Amino acid sequence: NITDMAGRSVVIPAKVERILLGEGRLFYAVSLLEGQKPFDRIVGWQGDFRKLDTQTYAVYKAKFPQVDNIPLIGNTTADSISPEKVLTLNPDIAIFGLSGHGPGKNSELVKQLEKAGVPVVFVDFRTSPLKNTLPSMRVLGKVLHREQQANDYIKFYEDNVRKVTEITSKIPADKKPSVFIELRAGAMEECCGTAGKGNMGDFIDQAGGNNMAKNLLPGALGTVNLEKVLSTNPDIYIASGGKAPDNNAPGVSLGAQVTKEQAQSSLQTILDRKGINTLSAVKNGRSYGIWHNFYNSPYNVLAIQSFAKWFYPQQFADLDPNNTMNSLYSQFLAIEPTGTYWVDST
Amino acid sequence: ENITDMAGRSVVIPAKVERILLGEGRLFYAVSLLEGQKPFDRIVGWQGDFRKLDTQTYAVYKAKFPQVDNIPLIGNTTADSISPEKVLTLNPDIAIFGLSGHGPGKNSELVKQLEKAGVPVVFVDFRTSPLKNTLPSMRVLGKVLHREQQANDYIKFYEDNVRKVTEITSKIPADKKPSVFIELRAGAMEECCGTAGKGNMGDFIDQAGGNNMAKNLLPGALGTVNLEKVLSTNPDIYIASGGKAPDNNAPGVSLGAQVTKEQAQSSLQTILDRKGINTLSAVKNGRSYGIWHNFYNSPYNVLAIQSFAKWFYPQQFADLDPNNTMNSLYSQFLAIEPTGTYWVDST
Amino acid sequence: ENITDMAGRSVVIPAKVERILLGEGRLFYAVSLLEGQKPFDRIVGWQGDFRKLDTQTYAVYKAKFPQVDNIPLIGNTTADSISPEKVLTLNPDIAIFGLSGHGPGKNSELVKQLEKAGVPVVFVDFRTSPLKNTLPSMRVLGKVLHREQQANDYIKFYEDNVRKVTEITSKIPADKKPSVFIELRAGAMEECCGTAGKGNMGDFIDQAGGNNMAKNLLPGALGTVNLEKVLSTNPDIYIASGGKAPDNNAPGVSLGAQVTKEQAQSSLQTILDRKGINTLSAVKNGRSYGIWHNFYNSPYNVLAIQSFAKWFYPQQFADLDPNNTMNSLYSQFLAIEPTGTYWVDST
Amino acid sequence: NITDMAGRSVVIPAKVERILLGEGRLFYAVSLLEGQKPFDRIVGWQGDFRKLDTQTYAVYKAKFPQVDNIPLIGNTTADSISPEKVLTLNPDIAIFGLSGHGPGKNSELVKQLEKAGVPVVFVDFRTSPLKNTLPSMRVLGKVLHREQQANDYIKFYEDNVRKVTEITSKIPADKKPSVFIELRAGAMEECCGTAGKGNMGDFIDQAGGNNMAKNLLPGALGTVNLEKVLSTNPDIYIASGGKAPDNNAPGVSLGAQVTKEQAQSSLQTILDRKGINTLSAVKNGRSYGIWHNFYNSPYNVLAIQSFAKWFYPQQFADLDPNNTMNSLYSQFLAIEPTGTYWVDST
Ligand SMILES: N=C(N)NCCC[C@H](NC(=O)c1cccc(O)c1O)C(=O)N[C@@H](CO)C(=O)O
Ligand SMILES: N=C(N)NCCC[C@H](NC(=O)c1cccc(O)c1O)C(=O)N[C@@H](CO)C(=O)O
Ligand SMILES: N=C(N)NCCC[C@H](NC(=O)c1cccc(O)c1O)C(=O)N[C@@H](CO)C(=O)O
Ligand SMILES: N=C(N)NCCC[C@H](NC(=O)c1cccc(O)c1O)C(=O)N[C@@H](CO)C(=O)O
Ligand SMILES: N=C(N)NCCC[C@H](NC(=O)c1cccc(O)c1O)C(=O)N[C@@H](CO)C(=O)O
Ligand SMILES: N=C(N)NCCC[C@H](NC(=O)c1cccc(O)c1O)C(=O)N[C@@H](CO)C(=O)O
Ligand SMILES: N=C(N)NCCC[C@H](NC(=O)c1cccc(O)c1O)C(=O)N[C@@H](CO)C(=O)O
Ligand SMILES: N=C(N)NCCC[C@H](NC(=O)c1cccc(O)c1O)C(=O)N[C@@H](CO)C(=O)O
Ligand SMILES: [Fe+3]
Ligand SMILES: [Fe+3]
């Protein structure tokens, strides 16, 4: 038996072959365990990975066209999941997130699955990445019978994060740069989405930054008004996005099918917005883009490294997130790394 | 009949208004120009900023209108302290909010609640972009409160009294303009120095033909510049804002309805005697002044634009008198008598 | 409604409170600022530290309120002496506890018992992290005791009176600051010398622009530094804390409501005449002072921050008088008259 | 009475009223001593200040038109100095530089002046700034009877340098960025002029940088070929210039009459040159401009600070060399600071 991220006891199945993904992008944690056979044990998933990660999807489709035939249990919201379609896939395990675009610990679907005799595991990369990322992988390892892959990934992760924390854990608060992260910048109805005590805030903390929204918000995600950002006038501005290159909607283009030219061109649009464009950080060129889906992925060590190099350029001159990304893919994944997951303003 | 507010949103003009909700208490100043001798007749409730952050002007209105104490306070001095429940049970027929300040903004939940309740919401602004927004705000308030005459009268008064300044300062070339720093609530904040960028009192500096040293240091209307940056820039003219009550020995400039010239100058001097500030060229040369803080969010801000022009070019505006303008303002529009000191020069 | 206490825990605000339990008796000081002329009206019971470790302030309240003797003592002066049974039979509707001190902490069994009994528990702090916690503690007590006005009034008073110090000391560079050692309950502990690290009275030294020699010797808010370490560091300024009653022949400094200047000066001198202490440069040079110990856990601690600044920079704070601040505090908030000596200088 | 920078003993004159400047830009050291009467005691000077510092000249001329009437003893080279014109000015002291566009310790003119009974003082801000800048000011103080001004300036300088060395003195060599400084970049016949163990090299050393030319060159100044720079591929590129805005000759525009936008546009031209534009430092945006005349001025504490903030951006985020310049001008000089003495690439 194991304790999941909701504190609940889960009896590990003897053999797993029918994994249900409550949130599609929980695939990222699964991908680190399944080696060259990524989709072999997925009976169905939330449609967020296919619809909100179109780039990473297309790359896996070109090498694995059977991905199109994995059933979508819903669209991009917990409320759109048919519990009936879920149960007819006869899962032998269901992986859910404490938060996100899929069911949480108190949903009806979780109770239905408990009545059906199906083990449910809660992980978390989104609410409390710092507390939860590694424990989540340890647990997924045990319940999916991929302890070796999991232990390998934890060692890789700890080592690559320790490269940052060995330095930033000793830096005193008054020497840290102030940071604002604008999630899905440009692309929300009301500006400005950001992270508080949690989510990408954990990355700012680890990378030795000072999140200006840490004390403005009670939860992991929330909203701060444009004028509050202008008034705080933080040292460093970071925008997250995952927009596909050939999408004329507002947002930052980043992901597997994005070139540096397009990442720079679209970040600039984001930085040219009224108000934003007068920020000291934007004028001084301390303005950056990070791929949004790192907000819910155990690949988040790539962002902690990208934030650290932006917060202390020379102290992390020698650190290369692209090499960490390449080591990750070659050691663990079944596709080749492409595209741009981070960008600096021209 | 609809109107476009200061947030760009369309608002349907109520047929009759008798229950005005003030998102920020000091938005009363705009309302006071419209309500003549019956200032508080139509106010169902307001933010507590006017009563708690404008104690002097409050006390003067209370002595003539004791019923002001019975207007409900929907919160203290911050948007986050407003109970949306208390707000809705006052059954307002209009809510007036500010684009910025100590009350809810355009994206607050309370604004959405009120829209669900069928209550028209109007955004005004005297604080973020006074130059763009002050007159349009009054025009709009005129239409939605059915006081078009009072509003048009006040716009004419305002335009004329500002034109007295801009007719001169609009033709002055940049290289003849004095550099200016305004230290908001000088001495009274934890961390020095609050100031205004391209907005707020910065708009007044611009209009009065001054050169705001913080214009390009800051992205927003308000922000913070460090003492050493001020010392380094060493601007021609120093201005401190305050609204401290006379009998308060804490640091801050005393200005307002119950402040005498002696208290305003004694307390400005304390502010100018602070380490660092006291080595400014502007302080040593006596180009140091005090302005009443609440002009940072009031359509009476024409008084500050004029005080600024007279400090920026003393001889060219020798003949201009802001005290005459305040008196014309009060007598024409208000229901109280002008008292106290709203600005001061160092001696 | 709900609020966050000083332990990070959410507390549901009772609709009406009439049975307040004080985990530490001297938490009364925070309550006294809210209860006006009816100080003891809502206290069902308290730890015996206020009655037994604050005999002077107790006696003054007893003479005006003899019913104070009938408030139940839930224990003596240590968390371990509190009977949880006596506590629960008082049927409290709220319990106020301190993150640290002579009463239960956040992990005690009594706190869990009360949670099982459906009784809200609120953690405040004036002792571990006064700088971070004093004002937030008062705001919180305001909300849960339905005295938001009194609390907000006291915060404004406090901020203003501290700002009188910090406006000056916040700009002073480290190399111009005096070194300071504070000896808590000097002369009265078994092993010399108790003091404060990064917390407790250390926060006051920091704010008053001093350099606490024990800041980096100690991990916690309280600890112990050896006499020889003090002698070796030989700090600029020596401060002794005490609260000993005048007619108490035990060792320590006499300070409090029933102490005269001469009893405070004479007893400080005994403390300064002790072997080792008496060779300190600060003692020989007369930069030696006494402060009332209980300021180590009281929102009246603004009086200590002000006494410290005036000892650290005598001429820069010549004009500041902590006695006026105490009198303004008492008259505005309390139900007794200020008496005695809360601070003393060596002759 | 005092030992100059050439090791020679100079007899302090009882009263000085006729100062001869071997190199015009030695005026900068004099200006720190003469308060509001900068030109009162100058009998004549080399034409380098008037002809190679046209901007700083024009600013002093607008307040002091009598500067145009100070005699020019030559143009911009030691060989163009008429010793006859020099001697008829009847100087009572001559200030010369160990190196530069004026006579050195072995020149004939120095011997002529010794025969004429005129005290000669050697200073140095150019060959060995680190060893010589402060001793030079101490000496000038004594011989010009401005000991107070000199001691005031030394304290100011030491304090403002200590702001840098407190941090960079504890950085180990292997964490330091490699740096190349291209003096009068774009403006020489043959690329690339630079500094070795001396001149602006001393500033790189102090600011915790690693001068790639330190061991390529024997002297304070020299030349390294473009290909050697490309091959070393240093972390940080710095170009010096002092070109006037309205001068369309090649080089970087910096000085009292230069705006930031003109300094950025002209630095960019310099960075767009063949070879230079493939440097990692240029592509990564670690490319900067510094005002050339800091290569021979006791105001050089401004460049040391500008270099440290470029070498360690976050560790010196709170340091402002512009506030330092302003404290310098207000405390010591008779004119108002204007223009751009340093620039970052867009
Ligand atoms: N399209 C929707 N209606 N909901 C989206 C899903 C869940 C929601 N998402 C976010 O808040 C969010 C914020 C910033 C950036 C993102 O990518 C986001 O997905 C959400 O998290 N809701 C909370 C509270 O209900 C939760 O599920 O815990
Ligand atoms: N809690 C909400 N209602 N909205 C916040 C999240 C929902 C929605 N998110 C996306 O469209 C999205 C796209 C790519 C990756 C993601 O994680 C996403 O969450 C959203 O942000 N909607 C905007 C309007 O488009 C909004 O509601 O502000
Ligand atoms: N007491 C508080 N914690 N907040 C007050 C809320 C408004 C805040 N005020 C200022 O920035 C300010 C600055 C100088 C002088 C003043 O009188 C001020 O009130 C504020 O303006 N917030 C901005 C952005 O947060 C806004 O609402 O647009
Ligand atoms: N946005 C903030 N966090 N601070 C700026 C304003 C908050 C507060 N304002 C006032 O007290 C105030 C008083 C009169 C008139 C106003 O318009 C006011 O805003 C403030 O300044 N607090 C101080 C704490 O003493 C501070 O922020 O340093
Ligand atoms: N009578 C006892 N045996 N213990 C008393 C408990 C409180 C204890 N007090 C001190 O350590 C102290 C030190 C110097 C001066 C004082 O007035 C003191 O009261 C205490 O603080 N305990 C801490 C650590 O154990 C706590 O409760 O967190
Ligand atoms: N936790 C401990 N063991 N000692 C430290 C404090 C215990 C005791 N404190 C007091 O008597 C006291 C008096 C007035 C006000 C206070 O806050 C007090 O704590 C104490 O000091 N004990 C001495 C023995 O006398 C000691 O332990 O050295
Ligand atoms: N105008 C000339 N033809 N010669 C000037 C003589 C000084 C010469 N200067 C430089 O080489 C120099 C190099 C880079 C950047 C500069 O600003 C320079 O002035 C020089 O230093 N010559 C040597 C050897 O005679 C010396 O003076 O020690
Ligand atoms: N020793 C040499 N022959 N040349 C190097 C310096 C001589 C000349 N110097 C300047 O133009 C100059 C301008 C401003 C400030 C200075 O210190 C200067 O030296 C020079 O650079 N000539 C170039 C021809 O463009 C060259 O020799 O490459
Ligand atoms: Fe999302
Ligand atoms: Fe305000």
PDB file of C-alpha atoms in Angstrom, chain B residues 196-338:
ATOM      1  CA  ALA B 196       3.752  59.901  -9.300  1.00  0.00           C
ATOM      2  CA  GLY B 197       4.867  58.791 -12.755  1.00  0.00           C
ATOM      3  CA  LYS B 198       3.006  59.472 -16.024  1.00  0.00           C
ATOM      4  CA  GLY B 199      -0.302  59.937 -14.179  1.00  0.00           C
ATOM      5  CA  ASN B 200      -1.753  61.186 -10.885  1.00  0.00           C
ATOM      6  CA  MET B 201      -0.093  64.421  -9.736  1.00  0.00           C
ATOM      7  CA  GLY B 202       2.370  63.866 -12.584  1.00  0.00           C
ATOM      8  CA  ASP B 203      -0.379  65.083 -14.900  1.00  0.00           C
ATOM      9  CA  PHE B 204      -0.461  68.313 -12.869  1.00  0.00           C
ATOM     10  CA  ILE B 205       3.286  68.787 -13.155  1.00  0.00           C
ATOM     11  CA  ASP B 206       2.992  68.272 -16.930  1.00  0.00           C
ATOM     12  CA  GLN B 207       0.146  70.784 -17.303  1.00  0.00           C
ATOM     13  CA  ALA B 208       1.844  73.368 -15.058  1.00  0.00           C
ATOM     14  CA  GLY B 209       4.866  73.227 -17.410  1.00  0.00           C
ATOM     15  CA  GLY B 210       7.113  71.252 -15.066  1.00  0.00           C
ATOM     16  CA  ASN B 211       9.365  68.274 -15.788  1.00  0.00           C
ATOM     17  CA  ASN B 212       8.554  65.323 -13.545  1.00  0.00           C
ATOM     18  CA  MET B 213      11.817  63.541 -12.694  1.00  0.00           C
ATOM     19  CA  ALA B 214       9.860  60.289 -12.098  1.00  0.00           C
ATOM     20  CA  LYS B 215       7.985  60.416 -15.434  1.00  0.00           C
ATOM     21  CA  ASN B 216      10.335  57.833 -16.984  1.00  0.00           C
ATOM     22  CA  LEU B 217      11.462  56.080 -13.763  1.00  0.00           C
ATOM     23  CA  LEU B 218       8.023  54.494 -13.302  1.00  0.00           C
ATOM     24  CA  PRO B 219       5.596  52.471 -15.452  1.00  0.00           C
ATOM     25  CA  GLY B 220       2.419  53.371 -13.556  1.00  0.00           C
ATOM     26  CA  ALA B 221       0.644  56.425 -12.163  1.00  0.00           C
ATOM     27  CA  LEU B 222       2.021  55.697  -8.697  1.00  0.00           C
ATOM     28  CA  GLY B 223       5.289  54.095  -7.631  1.00  0.00           C
ATOM     29  CA  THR B 224       8.429  54.423  -5.527  1.00  0.00           C
ATOM     30  CA  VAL B 225      11.817  56.051  -6.177  1.00  0.00           C
ATOM     31  CA  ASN B 226      14.660  55.705  -3.675  1.00  0.00           C
ATOM     32  CA  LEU B 227      15.973  58.696  -1.731  1.00  0.00           C
ATOM     33  CA  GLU B 228      19.419  58.396  -3.353  1.00  0.00           C
ATOM     34  CA  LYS B 229      17.918  58.587  -6.828  1.00  0.00           C
ATOM     35  CA  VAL B 230      16.229  61.853  -5.852  1.00  0.00           C
ATOM     36  CA  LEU B 231      19.437  63.250  -4.318  1.00  0.00           C
ATOM     37  CA  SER B 232      21.324  62.251  -7.499  1.00  0.00           C
ATOM     38  CA  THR B 233      18.835  63.836  -9.894  1.00  0.00           C
ATOM     39  CA  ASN B 234      18.820  66.899  -7.603  1.00  0.00           C
ATOM     40  CA  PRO B 235      15.662  68.477  -9.059  1.00  0.00           C
ATOM     41  CA  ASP B 236      14.957  72.195  -9.337  1.00  0.00           C
ATOM     42  CA  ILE B 237      11.732  71.972  -7.281  1.00  0.00           C
ATOM     43  CA  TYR B 238      10.696  69.724  -4.398  1.00  0.00           C
ATOM     44  CA  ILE B 239       7.001  69.207  -3.500  1.00  0.00           C
ATOM     45  CA  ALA B 240       5.674  67.232  -0.548  1.00  0.00           C
ATOM     46  CA  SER B 241       2.056  66.095  -0.300  1.00  0.00           C
ATOM     47  CA  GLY B 242       0.261  65.496   3.003  1.00  0.00           C
ATOM     48  CA  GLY B 243      -3.083  65.651   4.785  1.00  0.00           C
ATOM     49  CA  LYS B 244      -2.002  65.212   8.427  1.00  0.00           C
ATOM     50  CA  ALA B 245      -4.263  66.605  11.164  1.00  0.00           C
ATOM     51  CA  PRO B 246      -2.837  69.582  13.122  1.00  0.00           C
ATOM     52  CA  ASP B 247      -2.547  67.882  16.495  1.00  0.00           C
ATOM     53  CA  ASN B 248      -0.571  64.863  15.228  1.00  0.00           C
ATOM     54  CA  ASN B 249       3.135  64.942  16.145  1.00  0.00           C
ATOM     55  CA  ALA B 250       3.907  61.944  13.906  1.00  0.00           C
ATOM     56  CA  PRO B 251       5.903  62.714  10.710  1.00  0.00           C
ATOM     57  CA  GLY B 252       3.936  64.065   7.756  1.00  0.00           C
ATOM     58  CA  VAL B 253       2.812  67.453   6.373  1.00  0.00           C
ATOM     59  CA  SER B 254      -0.260  69.009   8.009  1.00  0.00           C
ATOM     60  CA  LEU B 255      -2.693  70.315   5.403  1.00  0.00           C
ATOM     61  CA  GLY B 256      -6.500  70.491   5.168  1.00  0.00           C
ATOM     62  CA  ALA B 257      -9.677  72.238   6.316  1.00  0.00           C
ATOM     63  CA  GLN B 258      -8.558  72.540   9.978  1.00  0.00           C
ATOM     64  CA  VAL B 259      -4.913  73.517   9.417  1.00  0.00           C
ATOM     65  CA  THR B 260      -3.511  76.999   9.896  1.00  0.00           C
ATOM     66  CA  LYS B 261      -0.673  78.419   7.784  1.00  0.00           C
ATOM     67  CA  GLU B 262       1.643  78.275  10.848  1.00  0.00           C
ATOM     68  CA  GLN B 263       1.022  74.508  11.325  1.00  0.00           C
ATOM     69  CA  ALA B 264       1.421  73.808   7.551  1.00  0.00           C
ATOM     70  CA  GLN B 265       4.797  75.627   7.425  1.00  0.00           C
ATOM     71  CA  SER B 266       6.070  74.241  10.766  1.00  0.00           C
ATOM     72  CA  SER B 267       5.235  70.729   9.653  1.00  0.00           C
ATOM     73  CA  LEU B 268       6.571  71.180   6.081  1.00  0.00           C
ATOM     74  CA  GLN B 269       9.840  72.310   7.687  1.00  0.00           C
ATOM     75  CA  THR B 270      10.090  69.069   9.700  1.00  0.00           C
ATOM     76  CA  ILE B 271       9.658  67.221   6.389  1.00  0.00           C
ATOM     77  CA  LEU B 272      12.384  69.324   4.750  1.00  0.00           C
ATOM     78  CA  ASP B 273      14.766  68.873   7.730  1.00  0.00           C
ATOM     79  CA  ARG B 274      15.014  65.066   7.196  1.00  0.00           C
ATOM     80  CA  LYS B 275      18.456  63.601   6.441  1.00  0.00           C
ATOM     81  CA  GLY B 276      19.192  63.645   2.716  1.00  0.00           C
ATOM     82  CA  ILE B 277      16.157  65.740   1.773  1.00  0.00           C
ATOM     83  CA  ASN B 278      17.781  68.704   3.542  1.00  0.00           C
ATOM     84  CA  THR B 279      20.779  68.670   1.182  1.00  0.00           C
ATOM     85  CA  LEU B 280      18.598  68.996  -1.936  1.00  0.00           C
ATOM     86  CA  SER B 281      19.362  72.116  -3.955  1.00  0.00           C
ATOM     87  CA  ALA B 282      15.612  72.804  -4.133  1.00  0.00           C
ATOM     88  CA  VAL B 283      15.343  72.736  -0.325  1.00  0.00           C
ATOM     89  CA  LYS B 284      18.411  74.970   0.187  1.00  0.00           C
ATOM     90  CA  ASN B 285      17.177  77.394  -2.523  1.00  0.00           C
ATOM     91  CA  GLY B 286      13.731  77.479  -0.883  1.00  0.00           C
ATOM     92  CA  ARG B 287      11.928  75.998  -3.915  1.00  0.00           C
ATOM     93  CA  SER B 288      10.162  73.601  -1.545  1.00  0.00           C
ATOM     94  CA  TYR B 289       6.402  73.320  -1.178  1.00  0.00           C
ATOM     95  CA  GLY B 290       3.488  71.406   0.307  1.00  0.00           C
ATOM     96  CA  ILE B 291       0.291  70.313  -1.469  1.00  0.00           C
ATOM     97  CA  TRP B 292      -2.756  68.636   0.072  1.00  0.00           C
ATOM     98  CA  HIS B 293      -2.586  64.935  -0.696  1.00  0.00           C
ATOM     99  CA  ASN B 294      -6.241  64.282  -1.525  1.00  0.00           C
ATOM    100  CA  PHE B 295      -5.879  66.417  -4.658  1.00  0.00           C
ATOM    101  CA  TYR B 296      -4.412  63.161  -5.969  1.00  0.00           C
ATOM    102  CA  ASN B 297      -8.022  61.999  -6.426  1.00  0.00           C
ATOM    103  CA  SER B 298     -10.399  64.972  -6.736  1.00  0.00           C
ATOM    104  CA  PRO B 299     -11.870  67.145  -9.535  1.00  0.00           C
ATOM    105  CA  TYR B 300     -10.857  70.092  -7.336  1.00  0.00           C
ATOM    106  CA  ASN B 301      -7.379  69.228  -8.697  1.00  0.00           C
ATOM    107  CA  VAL B 302      -7.404  72.479 -10.723  1.00  0.00           C
ATOM    108  CA  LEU B 303      -6.309  74.121  -7.409  1.00  0.00           C
ATOM    109  CA  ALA B 304      -3.150  71.955  -7.391  1.00  0.00           C
ATOM    110  CA  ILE B 305      -2.383  72.514 -11.135  1.00  0.00           C
ATOM    111  CA  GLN B 306      -2.508  76.286 -10.398  1.00  0.00           C
ATOM    112  CA  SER B 307      -0.376  76.051  -7.203  1.00  0.00           C
ATOM    113  CA  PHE B 308       2.166  74.062  -9.291  1.00  0.00           C
ATOM    114  CA  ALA B 309       2.312  76.683 -12.093  1.00  0.00           C
ATOM    115  CA  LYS B 310       2.873  79.465  -9.531  1.00  0.00           C
ATOM    116  CA  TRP B 311       5.765  77.447  -7.964  1.00  0.00           C
ATOM    117  CA  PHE B 312       7.181  76.581 -11.393  1.00  0.00           C
ATOM    118  CA  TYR B 313       7.103  80.161 -12.730  1.00  0.00           C
ATOM    119  CA  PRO B 314       6.453  82.570  -9.798  1.00  0.00           C
ATOM    120  CA  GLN B 315       6.441  85.828 -11.789  1.00  0.00           C
ATOM    121  CA  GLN B 316       4.534  84.615 -14.817  1.00  0.00           C
ATOM    122  CA  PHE B 317       1.705  83.583 -12.435  1.00  0.00           C
ATOM    123  CA  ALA B 318       2.105  86.411  -9.897  1.00  0.00           C
ATOM    124  CA  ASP B 319      -1.454  87.540 -10.719  1.00  0.00           C
ATOM    125  CA  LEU B 320      -2.990  84.034 -10.387  1.00  0.00           C
ATOM    126  CA  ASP B 321      -4.550  83.232  -6.979  1.00  0.00           C
ATOM    127  CA  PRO B 322      -5.620  79.592  -6.180  1.00  0.00           C
ATOM    128  CA  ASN B 323      -7.346  80.899  -2.980  1.00  0.00           C
ATOM    129  CA  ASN B 324      -9.687  82.985  -5.178  1.00  0.00           C
ATOM    130  CA  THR B 325     -10.324  79.883  -7.324  1.00  0.00           C
ATOM    131  CA  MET B 326     -11.104  77.738  -4.236  1.00  0.00           C
ATOM    132  CA  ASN B 327     -13.454  80.475  -2.978  1.00  0.00           C
ATOM    133  CA  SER B 328     -15.157  80.759  -6.409  1.00  0.00           C
ATOM    134  CA  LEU B 329     -15.396  76.955  -6.368  1.00  0.00           C
ATOM    135  CA  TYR B 330     -16.917  76.742  -2.855  1.00  0.00           C
ATOM    136  CA  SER B 331     -19.346  79.639  -3.216  1.00  0.00           C
ATOM    137  CA  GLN B 332     -20.575  78.537  -6.672  1.00  0.00           C
ATOM    138  CA  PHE B 333     -20.914  74.804  -5.956  1.00  0.00           C
ATOM    139  CA  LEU B 334     -20.572  73.732  -2.318  1.00  0.00           C
ATOM    140  CA  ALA B 335     -22.532  73.896   0.905  1.00  0.00           C
ATOM    141  CA  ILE B 336     -19.683  74.634   3.318  1.00  0.00           C
ATOM    142  CA  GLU B 337     -17.326  77.552   3.842  1.00  0.00           C
ATOM    143  CA  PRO B 338     -13.622  77.211   2.829  1.00  0.00           C
TER     144      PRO B 338
END
